[PDB]
């Protein structure tokens, strides 16, 4: 027993990231923004979802992100990063403390879909208890 129909994902992340299209092609509703006040609101009505935080451009104050990710403990957060940032202790600490997985830029479709897809089970238990 497992889940495979794609759901919704919020991408706290500026710049078009190519991987986004591979999810939209397979059925994901891909909410996206670079402004955080809107994602906090959107995430309040969306409820539980997959969240991908783009840290791969010195584009967001990783202060502003982790405040968001902190506020929404029941989103399944994945980190997107450049391979180079695996060398950064600060980045590895954020991922390990606030995300459940990560992936880097050139990645095959099947790996990417499997990494998101593997959160669909959890995403259902999050929803069972969301009326908290």
TrEMBL record:
Keywords: ATP-binding, Nucleotide-binding, Transcription, Transcription regulation. The keyword Magnesium does not apply. GO terms for molecular function: ATP binding; sequence-specific DNA binding. One of its GO terms (biological process) is regulation of DNA-templated transcription. The chain holds residues 6 to 137 of 444 of the full protein. It comes from the Bacteria. This is Transcriptional regulator VpsR.
């Amino acid at each position: 027993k497992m889940d495979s129909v794609p759901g919704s994902l919020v991408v706290v992340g500026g710049t078009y990231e190519p991987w986004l299209s591979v999810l939209e092609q397979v059925g994901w509703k891909c909410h996206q923004c670079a402004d955080l006040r809107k994602v906090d609101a959107l995430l309040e009505d969306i409820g539980p979802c997959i969240g991908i935080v783009d840290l791969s451009h010195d584009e967001f104050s990783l202060n502003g992100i982790a405040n968001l990710v902190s506020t929404h403990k029941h989103v399944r957060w994945l980190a997107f990063i450049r391979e180079q940032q695996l060398s950064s202790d600060t980045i590895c600490q954020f991922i390990v403390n606030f995300c459940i997985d990560f992936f880097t830029a050139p990645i095959p479709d099947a790996q990417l879909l499997s990494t998101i897809g593997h959160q669909l089970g959890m995403l259902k238990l999050e929803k069972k208890v969301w009326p908290t």
